[PDB]
Design a protein around this nucleic acid. Structure first.
Ligand SMILES: [Mg+2]
Ligand SMILES: [Mg+2]
Ligand SMILES: [Mg+2]
Ligand SMILES: [Mg+2]
Ligand SMILES: [Mg+2]
Ligand SMILES: [Mg+2]
Ligand SMILES: [Mg+2]
Ligand SMILES: [Mg+2]
Ligand SMILES: [Mg+2]
Ligand SMILES: [Mg+2]
Ligand SMILES: [Mg+2]
Ligand SMILES: [Mg+2]
Ligand SMILES: [Mg+2]
Ligand SMILES: [Mg+2]
Ligand SMILES: [Mg+2]
Ligand SMILES: [Mg+2]
Ligand SMILES: [Mg+2]
Ligand SMILES: [Mg+2]
Ligand SMILES: [Mg+2]
Ligand SMILES: [Mg+2]
Ligand SMILES: [Mg+2]
Ligand SMILES: [Mg+2]
Ligand SMILES: [Mg+2]
Ligand SMILES: [Mg+2]
Ligand SMILES: [Zn+2]
Lengths: 224, 211, 114, 100, 127, 99, 144, 82
RNA sequence: CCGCACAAGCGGUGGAGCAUGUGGUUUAAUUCGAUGCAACGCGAAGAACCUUACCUGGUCUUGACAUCCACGGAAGUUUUCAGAGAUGAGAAUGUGCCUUCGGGAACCGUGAGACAGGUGCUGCAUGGCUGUCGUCAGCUCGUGUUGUGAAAUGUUGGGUUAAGUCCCGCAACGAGCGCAACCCUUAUCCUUUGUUGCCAGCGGUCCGGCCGGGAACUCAAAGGAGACUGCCAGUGAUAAACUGGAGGAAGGUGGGGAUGACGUCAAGUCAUCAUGGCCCUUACGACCAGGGCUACACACGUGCUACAAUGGCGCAUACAAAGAGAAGCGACCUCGCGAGAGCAAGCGGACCUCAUAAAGUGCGUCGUAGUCCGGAUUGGAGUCUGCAACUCGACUCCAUGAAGUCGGAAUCGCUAGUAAUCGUGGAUCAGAAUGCCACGGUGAAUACGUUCCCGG
């Protein structure tokens, strides 16, 4: 992504000067209208160097977890993961999701069992209310684990939107050593992101830019 | 509080009776008396064959008894000799032409009667009970049981005050009638007193009614 | 009017006004009436003595009033004289026919006493 | 109960069945209309000579497993207790918990 | 010509046969007054015909078993309503509006153990 | 001439199996049957005290429901009465034959 | 009702006047579920009431209960922590029932050998605001 | 009452005792337990020691007692008051 | 914040009579146990004998009941005397069966000890079973995270539910036991099968579905369909969900049941049974007759019947459900005022029988009274069951006609087919229901509300 490509999308946007985090000073161009302005001169090379690492991980058969819980951007992140056949979390993050990998496996198994049961049959054996209830639980589990039913082993890389909002995820990742790739607004604490992208995390246009560029490079890394 | 007998409540839904003959009120009582005494005789005589259930079904002129044991070769002895002997015996008790057809249980660790009597046989041999019950539950679920709960009550370890000790593992949903929950009770007579064991073994929901 | 026995019957349906006498009740009364031929719904007033004397004649056949009172008193006195169980319970003033006496035997013991 | 009671019951029934025919014929002669009151008299005297434990009205249905003299159920021949064990264990055919 | 309904109220069950006629009623081979001496039954039996305002166009022959005088009245009402609907199939909405098509499911409640009557409890005592 | 068959049982499954086999073998010999007709089942109810001592209020209610089927063969061939005798009868099912 | 304030069910009109209030009246007068006795009593009383009041017997019943219907009554409240009486207005549907209840008990107290007559006499005195049915209404108004 | 078609009741051991007593003249009070037997006309003037359950109380039969059971003259409960 | 907890209602109890249980007192004995809720119409679903455990007396000591030993006798059947009876004393008959012929089995009797026997104690040694808070929505765990740690979190909060019910929120994520569902029953319909059940169209008739029939309907009993907040609108964080509406036989867990979490009360039960220990053993065991458990100055609890006219009585007459039946239910006719009796059909039962439902309705009478209310009590006379109704049965008839005229403080049940009221059946049982468990008929009033009372 080129600085002009970002700027038109508005990547330079940042949270009000009232709300910023101390470590973000190096990445901040300045202020206008009491608004923090992010410096694309740092943003572009860091994003490119992160894309290099993401291409490397995906080119060694990496499993990628796209992470974002914004109600506006949930579908964008889900489609972004689907466009590169990668796993995703688009709904509210569950506490200790990576730390309780054993607990999630049972939920995935239950989600797989419910979908398998509906295809196999025995819904007729169940009472009509019971069969409907099983379908509702399967739908709830799909809303809960649609993205990670095919996760298999813990992921090899994480992409995070608004790292401050998803702080539990990054704490887990660091506890596991799983690398964190994150779009970091001025209000976020950048310590948890090993490849940090400072940029707007709310605006739909810039978020879609991030996701599309990442997914293009991930498909490229897969293609070899 | 008290709990309904799990086997006695699932007779209509998932559990078959153990005496399936028919008779009108004229000779209902004495049928019951005869089959009670014959099954008690068989229990007393097969205290080592490890029998789990003795089902009894009567043709109009005959009595048919099916034994469920874990040691078929034992009860049939040599060339079916002793089984024919006890067939003559049940012929005496019932006063009726008798037929005995033994049946085996493939997973003896999955029979509430069997595991309960084994627990009691261990207790009367003066072994620490916690070991007994936890070994039983471990074996059961190692043999692929959906759940099992063991319960012992009495003067455990010769206690002056009787305590209740249970141990559950897996799923044991007593309230769900659809569940195949096999249950049986055994007693062990030690010098201190009589100790009672109860075993629930849940082997999976049976979708699709009785049949 | 006047009927055999000291008591005077009141003016109402004969079958009922006849019950006034100590020895006659509802079935014996209608028996007396049918024997005398007088209907039941007739009153004792508006009833000529020509049938009143017949009524007293037919009631004379049965034991009634004072003679019955003396006869029952002799029977209880005889019972007491035998010394039989019933005689004892009669002179004791207690239920005679085997009723429960642990409680609620008041009809023969009178009101509760301290 | 006490073995004495069960023995008493078995003796009572084993005498009632024995003297059944004689008792029946004698009661017939007694209650029979047109019977000569001397024959009726001899019959009512003879009746009380038989063992008093021959009258069937003198027996008591006891639990056929414990001898309990209460809570009896003619259909099964057991007290109100043992019927519950036999039922819950699946020994009384076609017997199950009712609900309506 | 013939239109049949079947109405049940409480423990009673009534077959109802409807033919074009002058308003003649017959119940168990008896006239409506021969059967129901009580006027309220005499009115609840004819309520639907008053609704559809066809009380001299239809002769109906009905027979009812079980229940009591009012139970049977309700059963025959529910029967003649079903018969009418099978005869017209447009009075359905009106009869439904009057609550004549409901087959009231109310039934007597069983006695319960330790309870003198269904939902009735023995008298409690303090001391 | 005809033969009435009453079948009593304690469970409808067994009685239905047996009556199906009866009507089948009878139809097989060509004897004309009157179908299986379900007569009202009987329900004996026993309300028995659950507690050994002092609990009149606490008790349980059991029932024995006996099911009753009636089949009828109007023109019984001589290949039939012997045939139905040969047919095996379940121990639970009770069969009564009446010409 | 602590949790769910359930709505009241509907009563069926009377088969002689289609009047919901008459049916409520007979339901109040009823004893031991003997509806037929109650309807006999009420129709007898209404017709004799008609004889004294001329035309419109159902209307005469309406104005009779009107002349004794209550407007204000004392109500108890424990909000103070001690018993506390307060004068409160009564909804029409409830004062209907109160008037009917007062009428029937007053009739039972009247005696004179027949319920039919007691009810009619009480209704006739109620129609003209008398018979002590109004006096009981007046005293609970005074207690405001 | 017992009946009329069956006549009064008496157990024959008491009957034999009473006939042997009357035919033999004045006798010692007859010691019997049969409270259930009824007083017959022949036993008038006799004296029967009838069991009250703890002792045989004497009862001197009079013609008035005829048509009654013996037990009616042997009370089985002692009571004086409170 | 819920709960008939209160309020709002309807009917009661508390007063009377009686039924029944208990305390007490009494007794030769009034057998034992149950004792705030959660003992007191409780064990006991049925004490005249029996039961029966108690009392009095009469009797037995390897025994009433079991095994083992020998020894002798088939077994068994029929009578006689004594005795209250256990028991003794006999007296006749039989003296059989199998067997490789010796014997055995079968039982019976006598002796020998091993032993049996205990409803004797301990439910504070216990098992088993049960009550209770409570059908309450709770009780927990795994892993994760937090804290130095005891621990916490989850399980709290916002809402919402019958509910730890559900959705959001939230370092928690899930799980298990409960909740709910699965089961029974009930409310609609469909299919299948039509006799002993059914009678619409049919003809026929003695007017009787009764007979030709008919398979429609009712019904019977198997299988199946149906309800899902599924639809609509409104409300609401667009959430959960709630309100209303549609259609529908049924609407918001449709109604009822079964189902009782972890535990609490050293709760109950050694007298169902089992059982550790203790104790008894010519007796604390065993048998018999009679008595007692039914007492009676009292006290308490639960019921029944009443005090009437919305009723009583007379006459006429209509509409059920659910059950039971072979030593059983027992029709019809005959007899009896009646309970019943005689005769005797049918029915192991959709067939025959119990068994004609009663409130109701129509007519008549009764006229507010201790009554044509009430039925206690008592006299007389009976029937039936049973060896036997004295203690101490039920019922019938005639006679008798207490108290009682709506019940103090206080207190109980109940939210709809409910309460209230009316009958019917069953278990136990020879006989003995006002109790219990079930069935239907008629069929309400009220609920503003959670401040108080009580329990969670
Ligand atoms: Mg229970
Ligand atoms: Mg009289
Ligand atoms: Mg014993
Ligand atoms: Mg008896
Ligand atoms: Mg039957
Ligand atoms: Mg209140
Ligand atoms: Mg009282
Ligand atoms: Mg006592
Ligand atoms: Mg004791
Ligand atoms: Mg009770
Ligand atoms: Mg305890
Ligand atoms: Mg105790
Ligand atoms: Mg909690
Ligand atoms: Mg909350
Ligand atoms: Mg939470
Ligand atoms: Mg549940
Ligand atoms: Mg609606
Ligand atoms: Mg205790
Ligand atoms: Mg005795
Ligand atoms: Mg007693
Ligand atoms: Mg009277
Ligand atoms: Mg009087
Ligand atoms: Mg008066
Ligand atoms: Mg009812
Ligand atoms: Zn941001």
């Amino acid at each position: 992504v080129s600085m002009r490509d970002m700027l038109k999308a508005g990547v330079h946007f940042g949270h009000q000067t009232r709300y910023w985090n101390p470590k973000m000073k190096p990445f901040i161009f300045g202020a206008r209208n009491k608004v923090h302005i992010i410096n694309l001169e740092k943003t572009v090379p860091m994003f490119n160097e992160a894309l290099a690492e993401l291409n490397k991980i995906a080119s060694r058969k990496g499993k990628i977890l796209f992470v974002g819980t914004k109600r506006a951007a949930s579908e964008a992140v889900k489609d972004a993961a689907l466009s590169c056949d990668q796993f995703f979390v688009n709904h509210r993050w569950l506490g200790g999701m990576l730390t309780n990998w054993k607990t999630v496996r049972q939920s995935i198994k239950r989600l797989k069992d419910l979908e398998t049961q509906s295809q196999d049959g025995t819904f007729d054996k169940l009472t009509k209310k019971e069969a409907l209830m099983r379908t509702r639980e399967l739908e709830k589990l799909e809303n809960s684990l649609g993205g990670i039913k095919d996760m298999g082993g813990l992921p090899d890389a994480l992409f995070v939107i608004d790292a401050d909002h998803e702080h539990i995820a990054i704490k887990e990742a660091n506890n596991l050593g799983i690398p964190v790739f994150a779009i970091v607004d001025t209000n976020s604490d950048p310590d948890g992101v090993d490849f940090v992208i400072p940029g707007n995390d709310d605006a739909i246009r810039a978020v879609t830019l991030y996701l599309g560029a990442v997914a293009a490079t991930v498909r490229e890394g897969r293609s070899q | 509080g008290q709990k309904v007998h799990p086997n006695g409540i699932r007779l209509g839904i998932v559990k078959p009776w153990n005496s399936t003959w028919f008779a009108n009120t004229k000779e209902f009582a004495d049928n019951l008396d005869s089959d009670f005494k014959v099954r008690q005789y068989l229990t007393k005589e097969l205290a080592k064959a490890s029998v789990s259930r003795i089902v009894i079904e009567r043709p109009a002129k005959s009595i048919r008894v099916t034994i469920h044991t874990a040691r078929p070769g034992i009860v049939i002895g040599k060339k079916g000799e002793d089984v024919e002997k006890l067939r003559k015996v049940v012929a005496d008790i019932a006063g009726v032409p008798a037929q005995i057809n033994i049946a085996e249980v493939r997973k003896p660790e999955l029979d509430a009667k069997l595991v309960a009597d084994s627990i009691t046989s261990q207790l009367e041999r003066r072994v620490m009970f916690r070991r007994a019950m936890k070994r039983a539950v471990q074996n059961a679920m190692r043999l692929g049981a959906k759940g099992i709960k063991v319960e012992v009550s009495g003067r455990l370890g010769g206690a002056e005050i009787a305590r209740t000790e249970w141990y559950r593992e897996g799923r044991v949903p007593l309230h769900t009638l659809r569940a195949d929950i096999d249950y049986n009770t055994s007693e062990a007579h030690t010098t201190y007193g009589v100790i009672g064991v109860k075993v629930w073994i849940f082997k999976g929901e049976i979708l699709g009614g009785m049949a | 009017a006047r009927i055999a026995g000291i008591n005077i019957p009141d003016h109402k349906h004969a079958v009922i006004a006849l019950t006034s006498i100590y020895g006659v009740g509802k079935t014996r009364s209608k028996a007396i009436l049918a024997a005398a031929g007088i209907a039941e719904d007739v009153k004792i007033s508006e009833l000529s003595e020509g049938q009143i004397d017949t009524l007293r004649d037919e009631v004379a056949k049965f034991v009634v009033e004072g003679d019955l009172r003396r006869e029952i008193s002799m029977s209880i006195k005889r019972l007491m004289d035998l010394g039989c169980y019933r005689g004892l319970r009669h002179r004791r003033g207690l239920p005679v026919r085997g009723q429960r006496t642990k409680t609620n035997a008041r009809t023969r013991k009178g009101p509760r006493k301290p | 109960a006490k073995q004495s009671m069960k023995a008493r019951e078995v003796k009572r029934v084993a005498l009632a069945d024995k003297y059944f025919a004689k008792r029946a014929e004698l009661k017939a002669i007694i209650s029979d209309v047109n019977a000569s009151d001397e024959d009726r008299w001899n019959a009512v005297l003879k009746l009380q000579t038989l063992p008093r434990d021959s009258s069937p009205s003198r027996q008591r249905n006891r639990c056929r497993q414990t001898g309990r003299p209460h809570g009896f159920l003619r259909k099964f021949g057991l007290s109100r207790i043992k019927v519950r064990e036999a039922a819950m264990r699946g020994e009384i055919p076609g017997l199950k918990k009712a609900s309506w | 010509n013939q239109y049949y309904g079947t109405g049940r109220r409480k423990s009673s069950a009534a077959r109802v046969f409807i033919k074009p006629g002058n308003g003649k009623i017959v119940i168990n081979q008896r006239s409506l007054e021969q059967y129901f001496g009580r006027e309220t039954a005499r009115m609840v039996v004819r309520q639907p015909l008053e609704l559809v305002d066809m009380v001299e166009k239809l002769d109906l022959y009905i027979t009812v078993k079980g229940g009591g005088i009012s139970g049977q009245a309700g059963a025959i009402r529910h029967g003649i309503t079903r018969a009418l609907m099978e005869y017209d199939e447009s009075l359905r909405s009106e009869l439904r509006k009057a609550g004549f098509v409901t087959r009231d499911a109310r039934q007597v409640e069983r006695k319960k153990v330790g309870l003198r009557k269904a939902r009735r409890r023995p008298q409690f005592s303090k001391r | 001439q005809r033969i009435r068959i009453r079948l009593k049982a304690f469970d409808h499954r067994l009685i239905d199996q047996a009556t199906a086999e009866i009507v089948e073998t009878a139809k097989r010999t060509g004897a004309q049957v009157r179908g299986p007709i379900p007569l009202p089942t009987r329900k004996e109810r026993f309300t028995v005290l659950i507690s050994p001592h002092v609990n009149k209020d606490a008790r349980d209610q059991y029932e024995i429901r006996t099911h009753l089927r009636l089949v009828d063969i109007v023109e019984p061939t001589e290949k039939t009465v012997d045939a139905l005798m040969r047919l095996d009868l379940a121990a639970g099912v009770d069969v009564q034959i009446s010409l | 009702p602590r949790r769910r304030v359930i709505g009241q069910r509907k009563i069926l009109p009377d088969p002689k006047f289609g009047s919901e209030l008459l049916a409520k009246f007979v339901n109040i007068l009823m004893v031991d579920g003997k509806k037929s006795t109650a309807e006999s009593i009420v129709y007898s009383a209404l017709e004799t009431l008609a004889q004294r009041s001329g035309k419109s017997e159902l209307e005469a019943f309406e104005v009779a209960l009107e002349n004794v219907r209550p407007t204000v009554e004392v109500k108890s409240r424990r909000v103070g922590g001690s018993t506390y009486q307060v004068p409160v207005e009564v909804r029409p549907v409830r004062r209907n029932a109160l008037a009917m209840r007062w009428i029937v008990e007053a009739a039972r107290k009247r005696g004179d050998k027949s319920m039919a007559l007691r009810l009619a006499n009480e209704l006739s005195d109620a129609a003209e605001n008398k018979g002590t049915a109004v006096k009981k209404r007046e005293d609970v108004h005074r207690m405001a | 009452p017992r009946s009329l078609k069956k006549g009064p009741f008496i157990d024959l051991h008491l009957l034999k005792k009473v006939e042997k007593a009357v035919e033999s003249g004045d006798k010692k009070p007859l010691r019997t337990w049969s409270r259930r037997s009824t007083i017959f006309p022949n036993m008038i003037g006799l004296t029967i020691a009838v069991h009250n359950g703890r002792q045989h109380v004497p009862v001197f039969v009079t013609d008035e007692m005829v048509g009654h059971k013996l037990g009616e003259f042997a009370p089985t409960r002692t009571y004086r008051g409170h």
